[PDB]
Amino acid sequence: EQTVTEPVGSYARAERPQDFEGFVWRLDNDGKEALPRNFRTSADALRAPEKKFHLDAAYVPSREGMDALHISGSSAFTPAQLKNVAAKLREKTAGPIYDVDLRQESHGYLDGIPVSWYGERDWANLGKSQHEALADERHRLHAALHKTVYIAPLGKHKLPEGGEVRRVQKVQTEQEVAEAAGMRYFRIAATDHVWPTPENIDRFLAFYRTLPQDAWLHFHSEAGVGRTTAFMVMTDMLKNPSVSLKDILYRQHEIGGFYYGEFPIKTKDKDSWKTKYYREKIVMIEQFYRYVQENRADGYQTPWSVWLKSHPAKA
Amino acid sequence: EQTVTEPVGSYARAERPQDFEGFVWRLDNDGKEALPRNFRTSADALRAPEKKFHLDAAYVPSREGMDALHISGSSAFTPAQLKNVAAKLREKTAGPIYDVDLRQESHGYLDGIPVSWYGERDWANLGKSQHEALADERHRLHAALHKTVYIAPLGKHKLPEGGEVRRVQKVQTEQEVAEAAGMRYFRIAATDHVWPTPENIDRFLAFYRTLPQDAWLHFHSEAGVGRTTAFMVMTDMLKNPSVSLKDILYRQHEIGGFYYGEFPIKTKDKDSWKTKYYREKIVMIEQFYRYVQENRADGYQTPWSVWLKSHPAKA
Numbered sequence: 358e359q360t361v362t363e364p365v366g367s368y369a370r371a372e373r374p375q376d377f378e379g380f381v382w383r384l385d386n387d388g389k390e391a392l393p394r395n396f397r398t399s400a401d402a403l404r405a406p407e408k409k410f411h412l413d414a415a416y417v418p419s420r421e422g423m424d425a426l427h428i429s430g431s432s433a434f435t436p437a438q439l440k441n442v443a444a445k446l447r448e449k450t451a452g453p454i455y456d457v458d459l460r461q462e463s464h465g466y467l468d469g470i471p472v473s474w475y476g477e478r479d480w481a482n483l484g485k486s487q488h489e490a491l492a493d494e495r496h497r498l499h500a501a502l503h504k505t506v507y508i509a510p511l512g513k514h515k516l517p518e519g520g521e522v523r524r525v526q527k528v529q530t531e532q533e534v535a536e537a538a539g540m541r542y543f544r545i546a547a548t549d550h551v552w553p554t555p556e557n558i559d560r561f562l563a564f565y566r567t568l569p570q571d572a573w574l575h576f577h578s579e580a581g582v583g584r585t586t587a588f589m590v591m592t593d594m595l596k597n598p599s600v601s602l603k604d605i606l607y608r609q610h611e612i613g614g615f616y617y618g619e620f621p622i623k624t625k626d627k628d629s630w631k632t633k634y635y636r637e638k639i640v641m642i643e644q645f646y647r648y649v650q651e652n653r654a655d656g657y658q659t660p661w662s663v664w665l666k667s668h669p670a671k672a
Numbered sequence: 673e674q675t676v677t678e679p680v681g682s683y684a685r686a687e688r689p690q691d692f693e694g695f696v697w698r699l700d701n702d703g704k705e706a707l708p709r710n711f712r713t714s715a716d717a718l719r720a721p722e723k724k725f726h727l728d729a730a731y732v733p734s735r736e737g738m739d740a741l742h743i744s745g746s747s748a749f750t751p752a753q754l755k756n757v758a759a760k761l762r763e764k765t766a767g768p769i770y771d772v773d774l775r776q777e778s779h780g781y782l783d784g785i786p787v788s789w790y791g792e793r794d795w796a797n798l799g800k801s802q803h804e805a806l807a808d809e810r811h812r813l814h815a816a817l818h819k820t821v822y823i824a825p826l827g828k829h830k831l832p833e834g835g836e837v838r839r840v841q842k843v844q845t846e847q848e849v850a851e852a853a854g855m856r857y858f859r860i861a862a863t864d865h866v867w868p869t870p871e872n873i874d875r876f877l878a879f880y881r882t883l884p885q886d887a888w889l890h891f892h893s894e895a896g897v898g899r900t901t902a903f904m905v906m907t908d909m910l911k912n913p914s915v916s917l918k919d920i921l922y923r924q925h926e927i928g929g930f931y932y933g934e935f936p937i938k939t940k941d942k943d944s945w946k947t948k949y950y951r952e953k954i955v956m957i958e959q960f961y962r963y964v965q966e967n968r969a970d971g972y973q974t975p976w977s978v979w980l981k982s983h984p985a986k987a
């Protein structure tokens with residue numbers, strides 16, 4: 358027919374939340390290193406591209422605007438690691454430093470240990486509104502206080518392996534941990550592995566509009582790869598609209614992020630469900646760039662969700 | 673001074689239940705074999721003793737009373753394995769066959785899979801009365817229905833390793849499963865690793881008293897070793913009081929059970945806590961033998977718990 362059930366950029370809406378409910382408190386960071394994993398800032402030197410993306414290692418992207426961009430990204434962290442990050446970022450700016458938490462999955466800290474309520478594909482909060490996801494999170498964190506919990510790292514086949522059991526004496530939300538490290542906090546509940554929703558992006562752009570000139574944004578997700586890079590890319594496009602799409606994509610990849618341009622996708626058989634979500638992200642990244650280019654001149658009078666509905670992306 | 677806080681036979685009462693709360697649905701049997709592990713009956717041939725017990729391999733225990741004993745023991749089982757056990761036992765008797773469940777830990781069947789709510793040392797119900805342990809079990813099993821659960825086998829260090837996640841469509845208690853296999857059901861909530869309590873034994877003795885002559889008792893615990901052998905030994909002593917302690921202990925061991933007499937206890941560093949519980953069971957097995965010998969003449973008018981308080985065991 359002519360009516361589409363889920364438009365491009367919303368494929369995840371077709372999945373059934375009940376088939377991915379949370380079943381374990383996953384260890385988000387073992388706390389052994391001084392900093393979170395995949396830590397990088399926009400002032401960093403560009404490195405050779407990762408071979409899996411089949412890029413031109415000889416291409417030198419423009420760094421126009423990177424010194425003033427003021428953003429960084431990383432994986433999840435322990436409280437001590439976030440204090441190290443905050444201290445490092447303070448050496449680069451006198452503006453407010455934001456911990457921009459991009460995780461939809463319920464997470465927090467049990468006795469200072471960074472944990473998340475993990476469901477298959479990390480989709481324990483799939484389908485929930487940001488309100489419902491945050492309510493789940495608060496309820497779960499609180500329920501763990503003075504209770505025995507099993508906290509484990511995921512091993513072979515994304516299933517618990519080893520870990521530890523403890524009776525919890527202290528519970529904190531990431532907001533509390535960010536404030537204790539001297540950072541401002543802003544939450545965007547984005548689903549792991551997929552393109553952020555129009556709701557997620559409209560929320561980010563509204564937040565972006567409120568920032569003072571010297572604000573520094575430290576984005577993070579679980580690994581500091583998929584969601585973190587998507588938002589770092591969006592920020593680079595918004596702040597440096599005259600830079601080419603290719604340069605934005607190459608430079609965000611070359612300072613240590615994911616590469617959001619076209620590349621030959623290949624997954625292990627067990628990860629084949631990811632293929633179309635990668636393809637969806639490549640197309641949406643181009644569509645967001647188009648949104649920025651067509652709406653920056655009038656100051657974004659119309660939001661991303663609205664413009665995308667009248668300018669749908671195509672596979 | 674004079675007053676003793678915990679008498680011999682009750683050491684476990686000094687442990688703190690809050691430090692061993694349940695944290696995972698442990699897989700009790702993977703269902704691969706036709707029968708549960710350590711399956712054996714009193715009609716079986718005696719085999720050579722296990723080396724670790726340092727026994728006399730040349731010794732020939734008396735079998736006096738074994739053919740009429742009518743008892744068996746095994747590990748936990750899937751419903752299909754229990755049906756196989758019941759069919760096997762029916763070839764040996766025309767009397768009622770009892771599934772004597774000796775597990776204090778909460779356990780049952782989720783989608784037919786035998787599971788238990790596991791806490792450190794398998795002590796998730798330590799300290800609870802049987803009434804409280806069964807209420808915990810009934811609430812946990814029921815709460816699992818239509819919910820997502822993580823079921824895993826324990827691997828390295830008694831922590832989950834691998835396993836599976838499933839949204840449960842069927843929940844059953846072992847009572848339901850035993851009845852489906854054509855067995856009567858009798859529960860004694862005995863704590864894993866330790867000597868059965870005076871309450872556990874008083875309950876068993878009262879049940880034993882009213883059994884029809886041709887009743888067949890199939891005992892089981894998790895592995896079919898510690899608790900299963902303790903009750904098989906007690907039944908053998910009760911039913912065959914003229915048989916020597918040495919013969920009872922050797923023969924229950926030689927048909928496939930644990931050896932409940934003195935031996936060179938040698939544990940790994942991580943299992944050193946077990947040492948005193950072994951020593952306690954050796955002493956209590958002797959004390960129970962004394963009880964049977966001294967109370968059989970009047971038909972056991974004095975319960976085990978009462979008699980033990982007036983004749984305490986000595987370390």
Ligand SMILES: O=P(O)(O)O[C@H]1[C@H](O)[C@@H](OP(=O)(O)O)[C@H](OP(=O)(O)O)[C@@H](OP(=O)(O)O)[C@H]1O
Pocket residue numbers: 478479549550577578579580581582583584585631
């Ligand atoms: O949290 P963000 O920073 O968004 O990054 C995600 C998480 O690290 C994912 O692991 P998890 O779901 O266990 O938290 C990982 O999936 P895998 O571990 O399956 O590789 C993703 O890579 P890909 O899904 O491969 O693209 C990566 O993009």
Ligand SMILES: O=P(O)(O)O[C@H]1[C@H](O)[C@@H](OP(=O)(O)O)[C@H](OP(=O)(O)O)[C@@H](OP(=O)(O)O)[C@H]1O
Pocket residue numbers: 793794864865892893894895896897898899900946
């Ligand atoms: O269930 P019953 O038949 O009473 O047997 C018990 C359980 O199998 C215990 O394992 P679990 O705690 O995992 O249920 C096992 O401890 P280990 O598995 O640590 O060896 C005991 O041996 P010992 O504790 O070694 O005596 C054994 O006697």
Ligand SMILES: [Cl-]
Pocket residue numbers: 800801802803871
């Ligand atoms: Cl009781």
